[PDB]
Amino acid sequence: IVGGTASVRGEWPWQVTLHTTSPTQRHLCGGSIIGNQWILTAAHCFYGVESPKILRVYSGILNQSEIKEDTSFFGVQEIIIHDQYKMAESGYDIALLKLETTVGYGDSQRPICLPSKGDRNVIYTDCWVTGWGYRKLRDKIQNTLQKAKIPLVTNEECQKRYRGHKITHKMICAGYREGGKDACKGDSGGPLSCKHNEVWHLVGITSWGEGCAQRERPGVYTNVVEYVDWILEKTQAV
Amino acid sequence: CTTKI
Ligand SMILES: COC(=O)Nc1ccc2c(c1)NC(=O)C[C@@H](C)/C=C/C[C@H](NC(=O)/C=C/c1cc(Cl)ccc1-n1cnnn1)c1nc-2c[nH]1
């Protein structure tokens, strides 16, 4: 996260850190708890991941230093990538992780509400991007979860900022015209959380941008509301 | 939530 500040423990209890154990253990991506055996994240996170056996999901983490060999994690039973996904820049950058065991909800770990089809029309004014990613292009993963409040940008405005890309309505952009606050390397897969009528909603999934926090280069997020039926298809399968 | 998992 660029231009952010340290989060407080329990502030973003749906935020997870997804680690890979291959070749050595390291933070891979962010993610969000959306159900008691479900993590919503970005499809591009699994580039080169041949098995869910190398994945570890850590919930209830403020600081990466809380993670040692003896720290409890959730194993991943299955990786579900959207069928139409090719690359982050073309959209469909969405994936589900089916956990091997269920998450026990509490004040440290709980789900974020998915947006409603009725909320497709609402204007969100209190949106925050969170993660342990870099604070600039050449940096390192941050120990403490960071947060940055960023305004949503219309599709029309985001399309003029990304000449040469096709910014679809399945994408949602966020950033200040002057830049300064954004997601960066290591934040992808994590949430763009917006508070509406005192309820937090998972509006976006951190996907891509041209550099980090650059002027007139909004961060591009998977527009979660456009995938509610897809998530329900996968999580509510008979 | 309105949407239930
Ligand atoms: C010690 O642990 C570590 O150092 N771990 C550690 C460190 C870094 C990274 C990983 C693990 N993960 C990977 O490399 C896994 C692979 C598949 C993802 C590739 C893409 C991913 N993009 C983002 O996270 C965000 C992009 C992004 C998103 C928005 Cl909305 C705006 C601007 C963005 N940026 C443009 N340029 N940079 N950012 C990424 N993650 C890392 C590097 N790049």
Shortest CA distance from A198: residue in chain B: B1
**Tally of CB atoms within 10 A around A146:** 22
Stated resolution in angstroms:
2.1
Q: What stretches of A112-190 adopt beta strand conformation (E)?
A: 127-131, 146-149, 152-153, 171-174
- What is the rounded distance in angstroms from the CA atom of residue A177 to the CA atom of residue A228? 29
Annotated binding residue at A162?
Answer: yes
B contact residues 1-5, partner A, Cβ 8 Å cutoff = 1-3, 5
Backbone angle region of A175, left / alpha / beta, with phi > 0 → left and psi within -120 to 50 → alpha: left
CA atoms in the 13 A half-sphere facing the CB of A164: 1
- Say if residues A153 and A175 touch (Cβ distance below 8 Å): yes
**Tally of CB atoms within 10 A around A195:** 14
A13-111+227-238 — its CATH code? Answer: 2.40.10.10
Report the structure determination method: X-ray
Shortest CA distance from B2: residue in chain A: A116
User: Where in chain A are the domains?
Assistant: 1-12+112-226, 13-111+227-238
- Out of A188, A193, A201, A207, the active site residue is A188
